[PDB]
């Protein structure tokens, strides 16, 4: 209901109030990103949300911030993430200059799937990814 969701906005500003590289789109850097790639656990506007709705429910889970109810295991995949953490991994393999269509599709971007996702459900994550098998794009 109305209190679920209030809690959800107000998680969101703590993140972003937390690491301020929140507060500005994960792929334009424009301030005040009101959407998020849950997959991800980035703050994107709301034309690059556009951007990552044509990349396929196999490469970005995207969600409006204003508009749309969370599941609680979407707030981890945020609380576990944020741009910073995601920025970072994605520069360390050379991909964070990519254009989306290449940038995501990468086995670096795709990897760092795969270690959030074992953070929100607390198992091992995989094995390091090596930098030379980066920037070669997944099937
Ligand atoms: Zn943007």
Redesign the pocket.
């Known amino acids: 209901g109305s209190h679920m969701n209030a809690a959800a906005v107000e998680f969101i500003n703590r993140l972003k109030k937390e690491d301020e590289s929140n507060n500005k789109?994960?792929?334009?850097?424009?301030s005040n990103?009101d959407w998020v790639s849950v997959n991800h656990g980035i703050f994107?506007?709301i034309?690059?949300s556009g951007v990552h709705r044509s990349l396929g429910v196999h490469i970005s889970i995207v969600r409006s911030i204003k508009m749309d109810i969370f599941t609680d295991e979407q707030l981890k995949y945020i609380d576990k993430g944020g741009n910073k953490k995601c920025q970072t991994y994605l520069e360390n393999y050379g991909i964070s200059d990519f254009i989306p269509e290449r940038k995501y599709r990468t086995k670096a971007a795709d990897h760092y799937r795969k270690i959030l996702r074992s953070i929100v459900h607390n198992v091992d994550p995989p094995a390091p990814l090596p930098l030379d098998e980066g920037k070669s794009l997944i099937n």
């Open positions: 789109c994960f792929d334009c850097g424009i990103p994107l506007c034309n690059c």
